[PDB]
Amino acid sequence: MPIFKDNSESIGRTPLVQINRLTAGLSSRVLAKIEGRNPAYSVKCRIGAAMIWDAEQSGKLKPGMHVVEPTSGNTGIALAFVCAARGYKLTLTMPETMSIERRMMLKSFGADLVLTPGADGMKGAISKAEELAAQPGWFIPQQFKNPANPAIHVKTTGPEIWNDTEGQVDVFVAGVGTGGTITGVARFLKHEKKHPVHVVAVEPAASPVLAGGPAGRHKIQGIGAGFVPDTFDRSVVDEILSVTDDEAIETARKLAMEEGISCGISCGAAMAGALKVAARPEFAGKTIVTVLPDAGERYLSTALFENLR
Amino acid sequence: MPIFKDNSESIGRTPLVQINRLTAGLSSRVLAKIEGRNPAYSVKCRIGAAMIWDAEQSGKLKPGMHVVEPTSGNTGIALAFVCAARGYKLTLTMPETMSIERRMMLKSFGADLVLTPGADGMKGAISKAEELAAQPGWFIPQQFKNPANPAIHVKTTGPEIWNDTEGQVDVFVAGVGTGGTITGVARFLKHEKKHPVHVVAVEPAASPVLAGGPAGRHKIQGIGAGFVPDTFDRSVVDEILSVTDDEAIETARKLAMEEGISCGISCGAAMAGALKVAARPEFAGKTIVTVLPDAGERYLSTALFENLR
Numbered sequence A, B: 001m002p003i004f005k006d007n008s009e010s011i012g013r014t015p016l017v018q019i020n021r022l023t024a025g026l027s028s029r030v031l032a033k034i035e036g037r038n039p040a041y042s043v044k045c046r047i048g049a050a051m052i053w054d055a056e057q058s059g060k061l062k063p064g065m066h067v068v069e070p071t072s073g074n075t076g077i078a079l080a081f082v083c084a085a086r087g088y089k090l091t092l093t094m095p096e097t098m099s100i101e102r103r104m105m106l107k108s109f110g111a112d113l114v115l116t117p118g119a120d121g122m123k124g125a126i127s128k129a130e131e132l133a134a135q136p137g138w139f140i141p142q143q144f145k146n147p148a149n150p151a152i153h154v155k156t157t158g159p160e161i162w163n164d165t166e167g168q169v170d171v172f173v174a175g176v177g178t179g180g181t182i183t184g185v186a187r188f189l190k191h192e193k194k195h196p197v198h199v200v201a202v203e204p205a206a207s208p209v210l211a212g213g214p215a216g217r218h219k220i221q222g223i224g225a226g227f228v229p230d231t232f233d234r235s236v237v238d239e240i241l242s243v244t245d246d247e248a249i250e251t252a253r254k255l256a257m258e259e260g261i262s263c264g265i266s267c268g269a270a271m272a273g274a275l276k277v278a279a280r281p282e283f284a285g286k287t288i289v290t291v292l293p294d295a296g297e298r299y300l301s302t303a304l305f306e307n308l309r
Helices: A044-058 A074-086 A100-108 A118-133 A148-164 A180-192 A245-259 A265-278 A303-308 B044-058 B074-086 B100-108 B118-134 B148-164 B180-192 B245-259 B265-278 B303-308
Strands: A016-018 A029-034 A066-070 A089-095 A112-116 A171-175 A198-204 A239-243 A287-292 B016-018 B029-034 B066-070 B089-095 B112-116 B171-175 B198-204 B239-243 B287-292
Touching: A029 A148, A029 A265, A044 A074, A044 A148, A066 A074, A066 A118, A074 A089, A074 A100, A074 B245, A089 A118, A100 A112, A100 B245, A100 B303, A112 A118, A148 A180, A171 A180, A171 A265, A180 A198, A198 A265, A239 A265, A245 A265, A245 A303, A245 B074, A245 B100, A265 A287, A265 A303, A303 B100, B016 B148, B029 B148, B029 B265, B044 B074, B044 B148, B066 B074, B066 B118, B074 B089, B074 B100, B089 B118, B100 B112, B112 B118, B148 B180, B171 B180, B171 B265, B180 B198, B198 B265, B239 B265, B245 B265, B245 B303, B265 B287
Parallel strands: A029 A287, A066 A089, A089 A112, A171 A198, A171 A287, A198 A239, B029 B287, B066 B089, B089 B112, B171 B198, B171 B287, B198 B239
Antiparallel strands: A016 A029, B016 B029
């Protein structure tokens, strides 16, 4: 490995770990990519870095400009650590219904937070971010529209999976938030390596928007955005699979308990999908790869841990 | 990277990141090794894996046996994920001062917790664990005595530093808890690569036991054990340096804020010492390497985040 000139350069190179007890009695192989092991501990670190780097290259972002994005979750954390490592002023807009601890993490990187009325929800944070981003000197990455999001997974996540498995990956299963992960990995495998792979998107059964149903409330943070994102390319996805909130929560708990993998709720969702796919007779002896986006300690205040006080 | 057959094999291979703003105006070069990027997110993952593997190879640990260890933080977490990954019953002793968040992390891996009197500290934990380990069928790794602890650093941490710097490491600065990190890296560089390295042990000014002062209470968790561990090899250490709780907490805040590196209190302690050493005239144009043991989210409930409510 090189010496990274700042922490944003250290994204990726995450490990593939074989799942052993949740797969007991299957003849396929299930490998988990641990995206929790990133400079700011989630998969979003890849796109926080890539969207900043790409805006530098194109001139949309210049030194002294202000970065603004409407986000509570992992994307705010990634942008915060990247802007701190690379020296940009950062503002994040979020409804005031935001956990005091997620805000501490964001403020530890020196991000400025703009709370918008909780009643207007996410669309209120988006409106404020658009208003701020309209002024000159401010840049908005736009995580759901920015092609630099799937492109970094074409350049890093995709190749890492291809090379760590030595070309043995027959199924890729990924929860879909912005959809950049599943789009970039599928593009790399199918178009750049010409590799046959069955690509499965995972969404909450309570908000099955990718399969055409109506958005709803759900607890699988980071996926189920309530719309089909522009960064999600349905043409490289072969199947949509939904999981319940309880399946996701329980499978994340079993990943820690039975595999020693501390991970979040959407990790349980992805794995719960992957293990159902991996039980199909047509995939006997095949390799199923899935992504676990972040780590369990980010979920101490959530429903993931409520059974442990 | 290979496919890891379980999560314990995925230890290490952590990045070296150049520190840029905290070093502004020094002519030396300070590189931070990010041990938060480990399967259970601390440096102890290396020795949790290694001590279990070593006990398996030696026959001191067999399938069906019960693992027991005293811990005040990361060693419990490391052993917990390893025992979940590899299938051992685990019981940890710890003072009742252990935060609720730490307990929950240990419970998520299915470890049993035995609480010892808070005012008796680590020594009261060590004694209850020794008691429990007397039972036939029980095994105690003994993190302060087990040579498998510095050995894994001779085998992984040392070589990673040597390889990523291409033999450019003139100073090694590390906080001492068990001392295995500094002992193993220093043995590797001095005894095996025959490389001249100024090796700096960092301990709390409020508990300068390595320097022969009295044990005292302090907030730099993970270091300042209150005694000199057998796994600390004084013959490979060139200098003992004290840092205040205030220095450590503030420097950990500055690493997040000015570098985008979210890390723990002991990380600020090591960096506070590394920056002092790196400003010395004899190290102009030289390379100083230090270890940042874990990640910031483990410390939300601590004095590290007191300034953010």
